[PDB]
Design a protein. Structure first.
Lengths: 821, 148, 196
């Protein structure tokens, strides 16, 4: 955890190391309780003693509300009085042991002590690798949420009265011995009163300081950082509170007749940002009114103003990396889109009120059956749509939201799938009759759904709203599962896994979507940063042409691991932290030998030992028949999906190894080259390499603004046949390209054209890999499924050129440039 | 209803219970028929523990001759059991507002109706009560998701 | 390479010149043929065709066989294109369950068309060796912007209602005159597979 007995008052993370551990545990062997009783016995094992120390520092405070008494020359005695410092007090030597600790060092020690107490109290999952075998202190970008790079050219000693806004005089040299002590203390106090409860923890790291110096010198000498003291510059590390960071009001003292102390300190601290405001409950309060940004949070502005007021005018605070992370978020085509906070979901609420206005009209309609349930399972209902829901921006493929329609338990459902789905469609015709009869502001048409293969009659009901949203209705009955299982029982041995695939996509479509939307939208108020994480991660899949093959909900469940499994880190409190946790984990998880088992609950219903071991034995039974992961690569299983194959099947292997490979490229990139603008530009840079062919596409009409992405949508057209005029044809292009060349090719494309298709949102690229099965000559078969050419009268090899003419003529006007290997 | 939050000539409330008037059920209870009840303790998705009741009454069919049309004292076991397994299915899903959105048009009663009709047909069946005792926590986060 | 006229199992090698394109800097697509052998009534005088071109419709097949009749001066008329499941959509039959890939069967009008056109494919199979520029060029129909956005176009509602009423109005009456006891017979035949 990067902790040691080094002086943490010199701007470092330490003060508590091996020596204070030995003094503390040797003290706990001689008491430690409130009534001086024994916490740890000499006859305990090392796990029981270690659990006693971590349990003690997790439970018992020793900085503000307590301190510990002990005797070196009789038992240890906890006292419930703290002296606003980490205090470990001896009686025989009268030594405050934790003098080298700061207050935030002990609060961080108590938080990691509680995290490690929860890791030891975890009775299901492994935490040994978390506690003892994972260096969390390698990257401050992963160990902390917000690091601010602070430059302070203080100069020499005589320049300090012109470079320090505070006084470094007599009493400062008495108490705070060196300049890094009083400097780190000053930035800690001004930053703590500046942010306060917007964050969780905070450290001040003096970068580049030294304690080793040659024997020819009296002290440590330096000239770096525009000054001649022992550091280079000041970094501000931050662990952020998700609920209180991006608030528009920094509340101060209340307003009464006579000014108190804290109000004079409040206007003395903020000044022009200190003002009075009437709040909604009738109170009058000094506060600070701020503005959110779509490119940054408020915290950069608060630490910016506070360091540029109460430390030095010469301060240079920069964090442009997190500004680039907010600038790669899709900018919605909305009024006041620039001042929109990172944690605001108001367009989702507009789709929610639109859906409620739909539901109160349709749910009280009179039909031949009373309505059982109407279930929203769209992605926007679980806050996972890559573009935010923009009114009338139907060019984005996240526009139509999937809604299940379930009617009441009735024997009106035939025992054949065509008459069943056509009966559903005729019910949607009667609902369309009532809807067009009396809901003339709503619009509606019908569409096909071939995403369930061979079920050629699923017709979705498409309703366009005056709130600018579009939905689709699809009917689920009780007669479905019996008929599909009957088709499972009916098939011969040759046709079984394809009906496992149609049935598996059926369960992924109608069935698990309800509890999926329930669970994700239910716990969505527990991890508020998760939605820009999954939307940015889907954009990372879209830039590297990986969003098409790997499904969205699988990226949701892969992406949900840093929040539901916080160990050994904390809860991610920034897009940068959790996003590089997802990429970091995909870089260091091996899907062949390691399973991914999730726990989809709220923070402190969970799995027991028997269900967890049931999942792991399903992993063993998986890897018995699939040892190298040829058929099945990703295993993501939990309570709602114990199979692990429901949202992770049908995947070619170079897609998975290309995902893990580009993950290792990203993580090793941030290991080697550090973090700046250019490496983040490389993270969304499509390499377009190691392919058999690359096709360059451009539709002749740009569609970025029609996707609701600011670089405006107005209404739906009169003839809805014109909706196809603004709908992506390249998805049907690459769609049937995947459909014809399933056995012979692996094809990847950018599914979202308005996001990554250039400045106009009109560019695309098809990257194509030939499988290693079809690289050489093979015996000619009547069931070969490959475009070939004869090398003799019996063998054939793949003719690439004829496929190339078929792709170019299949993309007659949009294939502009064709590149090969 | 039950108060949770207050903001300055506004305060927000939450669903605590649902009850029938005394005039409504005492309208129903006629002579020469059988009164069938059921109770179930069942948890929601978010851990609201709530115990609902149930009321069930026997009707006469068309072209009955006899004046009572009672049950068999084993069909009542066959009636209480079908209601008991149905009520545990519909609870623990999509927190109580959608369950409140099912209680208002009483969709629950048709599900009771169709399944248990194969045993013995029925009449008026309603829900008659729901009350809660195990609210987990304060939890402002999910509260403001219903607001406009 | 050029001197190949037929495979081991008798498939006539049929070459195809491929047209040029903007993004491309003369290639030959290869479709193979055989006389189909089945006593089926709808499969008589058909050609078992392996590795067909992209978007193979009855129009461009009548175009190709029309070029065959124009070249060798014979008479051969094409009736119907059979089993052309290019994307795998009509592979798995599910409706009989719930109650040869990249091949086709080219149906002609009679036996003289498959005989004389079979001999015309016998002579056309040697033009890979003899005259490579005198081969028949295959011209693909090209799906435009409008053709790919046909898949997003709205369904025609009234013909759907016609297909509902005319679909149920025949099959529910055949079912209605083959009613209840036969239904018990078949479902409890899934009975004798349900115990045994």
């Amino acid at each position: 955890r990067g902790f040691s007995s080094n002086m943490s008052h010199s701007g470092s993370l330490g003060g508590f190391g091996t020596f204070e551990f030995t003094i503390l545990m040797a003290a706990l062997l001689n008491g430690g309780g409130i009534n001086s009783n024994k916490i740890l016995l000499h006859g305990f094992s090392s796990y029981q003693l270690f659990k006693g120390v971590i349990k003690y520092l997790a439970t018992m405070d020793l900085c503000h509300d307590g301190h510990l008494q002990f005797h070196s020359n009789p038992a240890s005695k906890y006292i419930d009085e703290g002296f606003q410092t980490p205090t470990l007090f001896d009686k025989s030597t009268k030594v405050n042991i934790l003098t080298k600790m700061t207050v935030s060092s002990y609060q961080i020690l108590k938080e990691y002590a509680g995290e490690t107490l929860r890791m030891l109290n975890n009775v299901v999952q492994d935490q040994f690798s978390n506690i003892f075998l994972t260096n969390i202190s390698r990257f401050d970008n992963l160990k902390y949420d917000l690091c601010y790079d602070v430059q302070l050219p203080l100069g020499k000693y005589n320049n300090l009265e012109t470079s320090l806004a505070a006084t470094f005089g007599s009493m400062e040299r008495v108490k705070f011995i060196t300049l890094e002590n009083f400097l780190a203390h000053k930035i800690t106090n001004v930053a703590r009163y500046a942010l306060g409860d917007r964050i969780k923890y905070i450290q001040i790291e003096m970068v580049g300081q030294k304690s080793d110096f040659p024997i020819t010198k009296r002290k440590v000498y330096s000239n770096t950082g525009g000054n001649h003291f022992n550091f280079d510059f000041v970094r501000v590390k931050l662990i952020v509170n998700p609920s209180e960071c991006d608030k528009l009001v920094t509340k101060g003292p209340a307003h009464s007749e006579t000014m108190s102390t804290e109000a004079a300190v409040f206007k003395n601290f903020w000044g022009i940002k200190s003002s009075l405001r009437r709040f909604k409950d009738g109170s009058i309060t000094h506060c600070c009114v701020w503005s959110t940004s779509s490119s940054e949070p408020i915290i950069s502005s608060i630490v910016n103003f506070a360091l540029q007021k109460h430390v030095s005018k010469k301060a240079q605070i920069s964090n442009e990396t997190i500004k680039k992370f907010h600038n790669f978020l899709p900018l919605p085509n909305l009024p006041s889109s620039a001042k929109t906070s990172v944690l605001n979901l108001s367009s989702f609420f507009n789709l929610k009120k639109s859906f409620d206005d739909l539901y109160k009209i349709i749910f009280q309609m009179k039909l031949p059956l009373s309505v059982k349930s109407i279930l929203p399972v769209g992605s926007a209902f679980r806050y996972t749509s890559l573009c935010q829901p923009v009114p009338f921006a139907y060019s984005d493929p996240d526009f139509f939201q999937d809604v299940i329609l379930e009617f009441e338990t009735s024997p009106k459902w035939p025992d054949e799938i065509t008459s069943l789905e056509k009966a559903k469609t005729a019910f949607l015709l009667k609902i369309q009759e009532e809807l067009s009869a009396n809901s003339s502001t709503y619009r509606s048409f019908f569409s096909r759904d071939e995403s369930i293969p061979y079920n050629l009659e699923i017709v979705t009901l498409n309703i366009l709203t005056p709130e600018g949203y579009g939905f689709k209705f699809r009917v689920l009955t009780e007669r479905d599962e019996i008929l599909y299982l009957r088709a499972i029982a009916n098939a011969r041995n040759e046709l079984k896994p394809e009906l496992e695939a149609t049935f598996l996509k059926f369960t992924a479509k109608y069935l698990a979507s309800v509890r999926h939307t329930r669970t994700l939208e239910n716990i969505s108020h527990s991890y508020q940063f998760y939605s820009p994480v999954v939307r940015l991660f889907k954009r990372w899949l879209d830039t590297h042409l990986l969003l098409g093959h790997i499904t969205d909900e699988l990226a949701e469940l892969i992406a949900i691991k840093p929040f539901v499994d916080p160990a050994p880190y904390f809860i991610p409190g920034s897009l940068e932290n959790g996003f590089l946790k997802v990429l970091k984990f995909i870089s260091q998880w091996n899907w062949k030998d390691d399973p991914l088992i999730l726990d989809l609950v709220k923070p402190e219903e969970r799995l027991t030992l028997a269900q967890y071991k049931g999942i792991q034995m399903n992993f063993t039974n998986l890897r018995n028949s699939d040892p190298n992961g040829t058929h099945l690569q990703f295993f993501v299983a939990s309570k709602n999906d114990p199979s692990g194959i429901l949202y992770s099947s049908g995947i070619p292997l170079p897609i998975a190894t290309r995902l893990t490979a580009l993950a290792k490229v990203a993580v090793n990139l941030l290991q080697t080259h550090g973090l700046n603008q250019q490496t983040i530009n490389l993270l969304f840079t499509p390499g377009l390499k190691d392919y058999d062919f690359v096709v360059d596409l451009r539709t002749p009409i740009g569609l970025k603004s029609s996707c609701g992405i600011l670089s405006a949508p107005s209404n739906f057209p009169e003839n809805l046949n014109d909706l196809s005029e603004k709908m992506d044809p390249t998805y049907q292009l690459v769609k049937y390209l995947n459909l014809k060349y399933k056995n012979s090719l692996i094809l990847s494309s950018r599914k979202y054209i308005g996001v990554n298709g250039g400045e106009k949102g009109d560019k695309n690229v098809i990257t194509g890999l030939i499988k290693p099965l079809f690289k050489g000559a093979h015996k000619f078969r009547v069931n070969l499924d490959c475009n070939v050419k004869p090398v003799d009268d019996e063998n054939v090899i793949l003719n690439k050129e004829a496929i190339f003419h078929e792709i170019a003529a299949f993309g007659n006007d949009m294939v502009i440039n064709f590149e090969t290997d | 209803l039950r108060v949770d939050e207050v903001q300055g000539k506004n305060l927000l409330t939450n669903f605590h219970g649902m009850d029938f008037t005394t005039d409504k059920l005492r309208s129903m209870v006629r002579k020469w028929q059988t009164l069938i009840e059921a109770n179930v303790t069942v948890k929601t998705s978010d851990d609201y523990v709530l115990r609902i009741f149930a009321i069930a009454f026997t009707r006469k069919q068309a072209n009955q001759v006899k004046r009572h049309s009672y049950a068999q004292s084993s069909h009542i076991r066959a009636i209480r059991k079908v209601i008991s397994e149905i009520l545990t299915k519909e609870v623990q899903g999509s927190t109580l507002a959608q369950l409140t959105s099912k209680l208002i048009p009483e969709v629950i009663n048709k599900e009771i109706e169709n399944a248990t009709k194969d045993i013995f047909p029925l009449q008026n069946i309603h829900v008659r009560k729901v009350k809660l005792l195990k609210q987990p926590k304060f939890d402002v986060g999910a509260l403001m998701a219903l607001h406009g | 390479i050029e001197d190949i006229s037929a495979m081991k199992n008798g498939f006539i090698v049929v070459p195809f010149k491929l047209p040029d394109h903007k993004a491309l800097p003369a290639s030959l697509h290869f479709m193979f043929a055989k006389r189909h052998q089945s006593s089926n009534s709808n499969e008589s005088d058909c050609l078992f065709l392996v590795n067909l071109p992209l978007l193979s419709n009855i129009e461009h097949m009548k175009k190709f066989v029309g070029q065959l009749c124009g070249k060798y001066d014979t008479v051969s008329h094409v009736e119907e294109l059979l089993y052309n499941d290019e994307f795998g959509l009509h592979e798995v039959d599910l409706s009989a369950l719930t109650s040869p890939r990249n091949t086709a069967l080219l149906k002609f009008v009679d036996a003289a068309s498959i005989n004389n056109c079979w001999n015309a494919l016998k002579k056309y199979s040697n033009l890979h060796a003899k005259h490579p520029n005198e081969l028949f060029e295959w011209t693909y129909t090209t799906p435009s912007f409008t053709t790919f956005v046909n898949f997003y176009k709205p369904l025609d509602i009234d013909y759907l209602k016609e297909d509902i009423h005319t679909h149920m109005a025949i099959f529910e009456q055949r079912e209605a005159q083959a009613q209840e006891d036969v239904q018990s017979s078949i479902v409890d035949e899934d009975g004798f597979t349900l115990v045994v």
